[PDB]
């Protein structure tokens, strides 16, 4: 369970390889989670309103 997102996760998708999970949430940020690591490697910002 990944809990860095503090708002509703609108969309969640897998990479075609599947090692990375992209979660786009109400927090304006898109977090990429490394499944083997279990950590948010990248936290894409820049969206003024909800993703």
């Amino acid at each position: 369970t990944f809990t860095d997102h503090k708002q509703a996760i609108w969309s969640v998708r897998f990479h075609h390889l599947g090692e990375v999970v992209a979660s786009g949430s109400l927090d304006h940020t898109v977090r990429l989670w490394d499944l083997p690591a279990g950590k948010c490697r990248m936290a894409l910002r820049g969206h003024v309103d909800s993703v």
């Binding site: 990479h15 075609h16 390889l17 090692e19 990375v20 990429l32 490394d34 083997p36 690591a37 490697r41 990248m42």
Partner: peptide, 12 residues
């Protein structure tokens, strides 16, 4: 970013 840089595979 473990394996986020592969060559494009399975163009389909």
């Amino acid at each position: 970013a473990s394996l986020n840089a592969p060559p494009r595979r399975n163009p389909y």
